[PDB]
Design a protein around this ligand. Structure first.
Ligand SMILES: NS(=O)(=O)c1nccc(-c2ccc(CO)cc2)c1-c1nn[nH]n1
Ligand SMILES: [Zn+2]
Length: 228
């Protein structure tokens, strides 16, 4: 079943993949859960997204040391908002190499985030320029276009049925696209479909604010966005 370490919750999704879940109480909304991933790649671990805070991100790392007991080689963060990048200082203090879209790093000061140590860039078709994402193992990084934010990125896990849509994708039973304050309403639908087309074989779609879902999450998000 699910495991807890401090304020964090961990769910095993596949033999080498776990989902990390952290919570932040928002003054007039209550607790909001955010999800990221932990991937075991041979003798090392790869992390996708921080928790909301530095303390919560340190809890992820200590759970990894306790449960997997393999070095964390790198972390990829999916856009410059608190749920995804709020724990950058904890990753840096633990000596983990950090990667984010160049645009996330450029927006990070205005967004109140700490930039990653390295910038990822992308081809016109959305795929990460390989020279900018060295030794990423099974992590396949894809920029689907502007949607939840202009800098949002996605990641597939090679050798699994998993693709991570971060905050771009909502579950198949979602009634709204969430916070559209920094969103591109014109391009959102095409970006949601581009994520789906980049990872055609992925049958488990992991996202930031809902539990893992089928490909139905991709099409239902795109239909909601078509109405924007
Ligand atoms: N990453 S963020 O800074 O923009 C953010 N911060 C806090 C809370 C939410 C949030 C999550 C779910 C819902 C349910 O409809 C509403 C808001 C988000 C959000 N919205 N969409 N993706 N994430
Ligand atoms: Zn966001």
């Amino acid at each position: 079943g699910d495991q807890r370490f401090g304020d964090l919750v961990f769910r095993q999704l596949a033999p080498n993949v776990w989902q990390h879940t952290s919570y932040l109480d928002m003054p007039g909304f209550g607790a909001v859960a955010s999800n990221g991933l932990i991937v075991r790649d041979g003798g090392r671990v790869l992390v996708v997204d921080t928790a909301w805070t530095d303390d919560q991100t340190a809890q992820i790392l200590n759970w990894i040391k306790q449960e997997i007991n393999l070095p964390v080689a790198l972390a990829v963060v999916t856009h410059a908002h608190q749920d995804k990048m709020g724990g950058m200082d904890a990753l840096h203090a633990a000596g983990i190499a950090t990667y984010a879209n160049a645009l996330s790093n450029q927006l990070a000061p205005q967004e109140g985030m700490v930039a990653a140590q390295h910038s990822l860039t992308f081809a016109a078709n959305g795929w990460v320029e390989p020279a900018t994402a060295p030794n990423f193992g099974p992590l396949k990084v894809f920029y689907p276009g502007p949607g939840h934010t202009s800098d949002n990125i996605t990641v597939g896990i090679d050798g699994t049925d998993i693709a991570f849509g971060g905050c771009l994708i909502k579950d198949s039973k979602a009634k709204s696209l969430g916070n559209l304050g920094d969103a591109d309403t014109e391009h959102y639908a095409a970006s949601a479909r581009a994520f789906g087309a980049a990872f055609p074989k992925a049958s488990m779609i992991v996202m930031s604010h809902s539990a893992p879902d089928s490909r139905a999450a991709i099409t239902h998000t795109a239909r909601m966005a078509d109405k924007l």
